[PDB]
Design a protein around this ligand. Structure first.
Ligand SMILES: Cc1cc2nc3c(=O)[nH]c(=O)nc-3n(C[C@H](O)[C@H](O)[C@H](O)COP(=O)(O)OP(=O)(O)OC[C@H]3O[C@@H](n4cnc5c(N)ncnc54)[C@H](O)[C@@H]3O)c2cc1C
Ligand SMILES: Cc1cc2nc3c(=O)[nH]c(=O)nc-3n(C[C@H](O)[C@H](O)[C@H](O)COP(=O)(O)OP(=O)(O)OC[C@H]3O[C@@H](n4cnc5c(N)ncnc54)[C@H](O)[C@@H]3O)c2cc1C
Ligand SMILES: NC(=O)C1=CN([C@@H]2O[C@H](COP(=O)(O)OP(=O)(O)OC[C@H]3O[C@@H](n4cnc5c(N)ncnc54)[C@H](OP(=O)(O)O)[C@@H]3O)[C@@H](O)[C@H]2O)C=CC1
Ligand SMILES: NC(=O)C1=CN([C@@H]2O[C@H](COP(=O)(O)OP(=O)(O)OC[C@H]3O[C@@H](n4cnc5c(N)ncnc54)[C@H](OP(=O)(O)O)[C@@H]3O)[C@@H](O)[C@H]2O)C=CC1
Lengths: 320, 319
């Protein structure tokens, strides 16, 4: 009788990897067509790069490097502050999935059992086992334990069996992010490959072809709006969002810009936790339900990975 | 720009009526194919709420209007109690109301011709700078809406309150208990005068004889304790165990039933009473109601809905 894991982003797959290394059977659930969550699923329109400040996470990254799924990104980075573009060099080590951000989670998932396009709506337990109800009213189960690995607002629905936990998780605010991708046939005549942006609807842009192993055919750019701007335009249409963020991009760039080959927009309602936490993970070991996610920690890739590990560590102790 | 109401149980429709009586347009959503929520009749069997009492004078007044309209009747069953292996008559001084021809007729009459989207499960609720918006399970946007009233069981409301985390954390602490309900029907009526029974020391909490509301069919409700212990049992097993509990307590022949159904209510009733009335973030424009804001009875849900609408109407002058 397997462990159910709800959410196949970094946190859920990290918990999955830990449990499977320990010999246990898992079954994964995601409402999306594929895995990866805010890493994006197999242009990098979600998470852009990540850093490793935790030695344990650093170790996992070295393992991903040796498996061929992560590499270092050293873009020529700029800053846009008060109407001025300026180079902003550093020596920060930044990692990206290769050949896209989605590659890390895809490899973590591997051949594990998974039910995609499966939105869980309820999680409840009998005297022994857990059961999941999905949005098509179908039952899934039995399961011995349940790990919730969703953004906090989406986990609260799944924690009715533990209202004290639900109440804590429901307090966790997430900020939204609108993303836009733009692709040019003629590359933009700038050496900029990424930019931290102030005083603008944008706070970040990245030049996809500067990342290792990406396709060079088009010069594609990813634009991330601030949370404040995203909130203010949360119900804007994709085409208005494209137009505004494209305009912001045209206003800070130092060079000419032809018409894009295509343009995309994507809204994340629950993109980033509003603040940081130190919980690591939240568990009701008595009932067998565990909660993890980036929002249990720093709200970065590293946080999500560490949270999934902590959830699985606690489950493993109690199994035994 | 209309007010969105998410849930077409009696709390949501009560809010709807109060808002529409005040001249304000609403739009109703429900994930089910029809309205009534836990006051729903299955096609006729009351599988959720069985009867209701009116103790609040305001709610009584509404019941009497419904009664004049033909949608409720006073139910006068021969009531029994089963205590310690003994079944005894248990008449009392409480007036009990039911919908007529079914418990659903009340909510159906309240909804009337109001705008409604059925089979529409809302999964996120968020606002831009101006208006509120709803996402459904098909990823379809609904809106713009001027305000939003959440009218669902508390565990189902938390996912819709992400725009108001403080409210969300309050709503999320509200425990709801499950009930397994079973309906059975017999070819020849059971040779007992009993028409209702309060049950102790049994998997069963309650049972009612349908034909005694204004084939001999019966509804059985299990205790929340037994329901939790068997929350993942199959329908056939539930039918079997609860039919058995009924055959054990009754004191006449009970031939095999000729029809049987089981229905699980995960969120049947709040585990405790509350005194909130409604919950709200009126500055943001989101309001929350349900039976679990008050007593966990039909009356509490109705009152909660009135209270949510009253709060919203009163706050308009500050907007
Ligand atoms: C625009 C954007 C840019 C970012 N940039 C960076 C960056 O530059 N650096 C960085 O370190 N981090 C960044 N992040 C954050 C990083 O992506 C996240 O911290 C990390 O990917 C979160 O992983 P997770 O497993 O906690 O959650 P998620 O990746 O959200 O995974 C949750 C999964 O659960 C699924 N799910 C949700 N509800 C249900 C349900 N009811 N039933 C079934 N499945 C469900 C979702 O579909 C999803 O797959 C960014 C995020 C966004 C949105
Ligand atoms: C077995 C049982 C027996 C009961 N017996 C009695 C009794 O004898 N006396 C008594 O007074 N009370 C009884 N009750 C309680 C009474 O039924 C409730 O107090 C009252 O009906 C609750 O009304 P409500 O509008 O708050 O919620 P509900 O009736 O639950 O309505 C909520 C509605 O919201 C909808 N909804 C939920 N989530 C979403 C979503 N995400 N998107 C869209 N729509 C959604 C649901 O489909 C439902 O229609 C009983 C309940 C049960 C289950
Ligand atoms: C989200 C991931 O954050 P993390 O994992 O911490 O990785 P980073 O350390 O690269 O991102 C942390 C923050 O530090 C600032 N920053 C980092 N490098 C530079 C630079 N060269 N020039 C200007 N600002 C910089 C940005 O904040 P800001 O954009 O607030 O300066 C950035 O959002
Ligand atoms: C949901 C209904 O709640 P409400 O609106 O309060 O309607 P009721 O007042 O009928 O139900 C309230 C509780 O009072 C007890 N009760 C009431 N009348 C009798 C009786 N005649 N014989 C035995 N027990 C009785 C039952 O509790 P118990 O079964 O605990 O006696 C019942 O669950």
């Amino acid at each position: 009788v397997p462990i159910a894991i709800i959410g196949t982003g970094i946190a859920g797959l990290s918990a999955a990897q830990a449990l499977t290394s320990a010999g246990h059977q898992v079954h994964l659930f995601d409402k999306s067509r594929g895995s990866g969550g805010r890493m994006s699923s197999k242009l990098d329109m979600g998470a852009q790069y990540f850093t490793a400040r935790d030695r344990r996470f650093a170790t996992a990254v070295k393992q991903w490097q040796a498996q061929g799924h992560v590499s270092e990104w050293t873009p020529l980075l700029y800053n846009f502050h008060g109407g001025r573009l300026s180079p902003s060099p550093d020596e920060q080590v930044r990692w990206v999935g290769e050949p896209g951000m989605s590659a890390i989670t895809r490899a973590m998932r591997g051949d594990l059992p998974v039910s995609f396009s499966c939105r869980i709506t309820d999680v409840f337990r009998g005297e022994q086992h857990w059961n999941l109800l999905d949005a098509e009213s179908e039952n899934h189960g039995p399961f011995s334990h349940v790990i919730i690995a969703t953004p906090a607002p989406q986990a609260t629905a799944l924690l009715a069996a533990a209202p004290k936990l639900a109440s804590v998780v429901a307090g966790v605010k997430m900020d939204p992010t609108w993303a836009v991708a733009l692709a040019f046939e003629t590359p933009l005549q700038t050496p900029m490959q990424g930019c931290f942006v102030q005083d603008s609807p944008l706070d970040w842009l990245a030049r996809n072809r500067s990342k290792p192993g990406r396709d060079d055919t088009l010069d594609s750019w990813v634009l991330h709006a601030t949370s404040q701007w995203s909130r203010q335009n949360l119900d804007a249409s994709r085409e208005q969002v494209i137009e505004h963020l494209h305009g912001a991009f045209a206003e800070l760039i130092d060079c000419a810009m032809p018409a894009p080959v295509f343009s995309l927009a994507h809204r994340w309602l629950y993109a980033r936790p509003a603040g940081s936490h130190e919980w690591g993970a939240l568990s009701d070991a008595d009932l067998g339900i565990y909660v993890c996610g980036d929002w249990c920690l720093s709200g970065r890739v590293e946080g999500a990975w560490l949270s999934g590990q902590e959830a699985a560590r606690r489950l493993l102790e109690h199994l035994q």
